[PDB]
C-alpha cells in the first residue's frame, strides 16, 4: 500500500463529496427544508477539512455553501456569530457575495444590504439596525434610510421593492443556476442511476 | 424533479460516504495519524445523520467507527465524555464490543477490561482505577487486581500479558480485517481508479 496514493484518493473523494453536499444544500435552501440544510451544512464543513489545496471551482463551491449558510441564518436571534465577527449574518453574506451576471449580482447585493438593516427592525433591535446601517453606508437616500430606522418605520414603502421575499426570490434564482451546473456531478449522478434502476 | 427520488439518492450517497469514511478512519487508526482520525471521525458523525434507517451492515460500520473513537481516546485526560456517561472511553468501547472470530473477540475484550483500569493508573488517577474495576468486576484474581490498584503497582507482571501495546496490536489485527472487507467499496474504488489513471 502507498500512503501517498491513499491520500490522493481521499482528496479525490473529498472533491466528489463537496459537490454532492453543495447540491444537497442548494436543494434544501430552495425547498425551505431547514433541518436538512442544517445537517448538510455540518457535513459540508467537516468534509471540506479533507481538502488542503482547492481549485478555483472548489473555492467557488465552498463560498456558495458559506454564503447560503449566512442567508439561511439571516433572521437569527443567536448572538454567537456576532459575538465572534462583530457583524450580523447578512453582513457576512454580503462580504462573501462581494467576491463570488452583473445585473443579478448587483440586485442581490442591494437586497442583502437593505435586508441586513430590515431584519434587525423586524426583530425589534433598532440599535443594531443603526449599527448595521453605519457599517454598510457610513446622501439623501442614506438620510432617508437613517430617518426610517430612527422612527422605527419598519413598513415604509422603501421595503416593498427591497423586501425579504424579493431577496429570497433573487437568491433562489441564482441557486437554480448552481443546481443546474452541479446536477450532473459524479456522486449524485451515480446515486440517481442506482435509484432509477430500482423502479 | 421528484423530492422522493432526490431523497433516495441522497441516502444511497450517504451509504457510500459512510463506507469511505470508515475505511479512512481504519487506515488513520492503523497508521497512528491522530489528526486525520479526528477529522475523519467528525465527517463520519455528520454523514451518519443522512441515514435514518440502517441495514445490518451499516449498523456494524457505524459501531466500528464509534468503537475505534473510544479506543483512540483511551488515555484521554478530558473529562467531558465521563461527565456525560459516568464511565471512561475504554469502558464505552467494551460496551460496543460486547455487541459487534470468538477467540480474537475474547482476547480483545479481556485486554480492554484490564487496560480500562491500567490507563487510569498510568495517568495517576487510582480512585478512577478502583471505580473502573468496581464497574467491570464488581474471586482471587479480582482480589489480586484490587491489591494491585490499592498498592499503585502499575508495573506488576500482570500487565505484561495484559499490556496497552498488546491491546492495540490485537485491535489493529481486527482493523486489518475491516480494511480488507471495505477496500473495494464504491467510493474508494472509483477514487483509486482516478489516481491510477494520472500515472
Ligand atoms: C424558505 C427559504 N429558507 N430556506 C432556508 C433553509 F434553511 F432551508 F436553507 C431558510 C430560509 O429562509
Ligand atoms: C466558515 C465556516 N463555514 N463552513 C461552511 C460550509 F458550509 F462551507 F461548510 C459554512 C460556514 O460558516
Ligand atoms: C450554522 C453555523 N454558522 N452560523 C453562521 C451564521 F453566520 F449564519 F450565523 C455561520 C456558521 O458557520
Ligand atoms: C498508534 C495507535 N493510535 N492511533 C490513534 C488514532 F487516533 F490515530 F486513531 C490513537 C492511537 O493510540
Ligand atoms: C455516538 C457519537 N459518535 N459517532 C461516531 C462516529 F464515528 F460513528 F461517527 C463516534 C461517536 O462517538
Ligand atoms: C471524539 C469525540 N468523542 N469522544 C469520545 C470518547 F469516548 F472517545 F472520548 C466519543 C466521542 O464521540
* DSSP secondary structure of B107-148: HHHHHHHHHHHHHHHHTT-HHHHHHHHHHHH--HHHHHHHHH
Say whether B13 and A20 touch across the interface (CB within 8 A): yes
CATH ID of A3-99+101-188, from 1.10.150.120, 3.40.50.1370, 3.30.2420.10, 1.25.40.210: 1.25.40.210
Task: Answer whether A180 touches B (CB < 8 Å).
Answer: no
Of A5, A43, A192, the CB nearest to B50: A43
Of A13, A49, A195, the CB nearest to B191: A13
What is the three-class DSSP state of B152? coil
Residue with cell 430552495: A30
Residues 6+ positions from B106 with CB-CB distance below 8 Å: none
Please check whether residue A47 is in contact with residue B45, taking contact to mean a CB–CB distance below 8 angstroms. Answer: no
Contacts of A2 in chain B (CB under 8 A): none
Question: A28: Cβ below 6 Å to ligand 1?
Answer: yes
Q: How many Å apart are CA B21 and CA A47, to the nearest integer? A: 10
The number of angstroms, rounded, from the C-alpha of B27 to the middle of its chain's C-alpha atoms is 13
Say whether A5 and B50 touch across the interface (CB within 8 A): no
Q: How many Å apart are CA A146 and CA A119, to the nearest integer? A: 15
Say whether A10 and B191 touch across the interface (CB within 8 A): yes
Angle between helices B186-197 and B3-31 (to 10 degrees): 70
Residue with cell 456558495: A64
Say whether B47 and A50 touch across the interface (CB within 8 A): no
What single DSSP character describes residue A164? H
Please check whether residue B11 is in contact with residue B50, taking contact to mean a CB–CB distance below 8 angstroms. Answer: yes
Question: B32: Cβ below 6 Å to ligand 4?
Answer: yes
What sign has the CA pseudo-torsion B47, B51, B54, B57? Answer: negative
- The cell numbers describing A103, all together, are 445585473
| CA dist list (Å): B123 to B84, B119, B130 | 20, 6, 13
Q: Where are the domains of chain A?
A: 3-99+101-188
Buried b (16+ CB within 10 A) or exposed e, B27-50: bbbbeebeebbebbbbbbbbbbeb
Residue from A44, A20, A26 nearest B42 by CA: A44
Task: Answer whether B77 touches A (CB < 8 Å).
Answer: no
Count the Cβ atoms, other than its own, within 10 Å of residue B112: 24
Give the angle subtended at the CA of B46 by the CAs of B44 and B51, to the nearest 5°. Answer: 90
Distance from CA of A32 to the nearest CA of B (A): 12
**Count of residues for chain B?**
199
Q: How many Å apart are CA B20 and CA B191, to the nearest integer? A: 10
| CA dist list (Å): A198 to A191, B1, B5, B17, B190 | 11, 17, 11, 20, 22
Q: How many Å apart are CA B186 and CA A155, to the nearest integer? A: 55
Residue from A147, A111, A141 nearest A129 by CA: A147
Resolution of the entry in angstroms = 1.9
- The cell numbers describing B150, all together, are 490499592
Method: X-ray
Buried b (16+ CB within 10 A) or exposed e, A18-54: bbbbbbbbbbbbbeebeebbebbbbbbbbbbebbeee
- For chain A, percent helix, then strand, then coil, each to nearest 5? 80, 0, 20
B62 alpha carbon, closest ligand: 5
What single DSSP character describes residue A32? T
Give the binding-site residues of ligand 6, using a 6 Å CB cut-off: B 41, 69-70, 73, 76, 81, 89, 92
- The cell numbers describing A42, all together, are 455540518
Task: Answer whether B197 touches A (CB < 8 Å).
Answer: no
- The cell numbers describing A98, all together, are 462581494
What sign has the CA pseudo-torsion B5, A72, A100, A56? Answer: negative
Say whether B31 and A192 touch across the interface (CB within 8 A): no
Question: B37: Cβ below 6 Å to ligand 4?
Answer: yes
B36 alpha carbon, closest ligand: 4
Own/partner pairs, B139-144, CB within 8 angstroms, 24+ separation: none
Q: What is the CA radius of gyration of chain B?
A: 20
Q: How many Å apart are CA A98 and CA A70, to the nearest integer? A: 14
Amino acid at each position: 500500500e502507498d500512503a501517498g496514493l491513499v491520500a490522493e484518493a481521499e482528496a479525490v473523494a473529498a472533491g466528489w463529496m463537496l459537490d454532492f453536499l453543495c447540491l444537497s444544500l442548494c436543494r434544501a435552501f430552495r425547498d425551505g427544508r431547514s433541518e436538512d440544510f442544517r445537517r448538510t451544512r455540518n457535513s459540508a464543513e467537516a468534509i471540506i477539512h479533507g481538502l488542503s489545496s482547492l481549485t478555483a471551482c472548489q473555492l467557488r463551491t465552498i463560498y456558495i455553501c458559506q454564503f447560503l449558510t449566512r442567508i439561511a441564518a439571516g433572521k437569527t436571534l443567536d448572538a454567537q456569530f456576532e459575538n465572534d465577527e462583530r457583524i450580523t449574518p447578512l453582513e457576512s453574506a454580503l462580504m462573501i457575495w462581494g467576491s463570488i451576471h452583473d445585473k443579478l449580482h448587483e440586485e442581490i447585493q442591494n437586497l442583502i444590504k437593505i435586508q441586513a438593516i430590515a431584519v434587525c427592525m423586524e426583530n425589534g433591535n433598532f440599535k443594531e439596525a443603526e449599527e448595521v446601517f453605519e457599517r454598510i453606508f457610513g446622501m439623501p437616500f442614506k438620510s432617508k434610510l437613517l430617518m426610517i430606522i430612527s422612527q422605527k418605520d419598519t413598513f415604509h414603502s422603501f421595503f416593498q421593492h427591497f423586501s425579504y421575499n424579493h431577496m429570497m426570490e433573487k437568491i433562489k434564482s441564482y441557486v437554480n443556476y448552481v443546481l443546474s451546473e452541479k446536477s450532473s456531478t459524479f456522486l449524485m449522478k451515480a446515486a440517481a442511476k442506482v435509484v432509477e434502476s430500482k423502479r
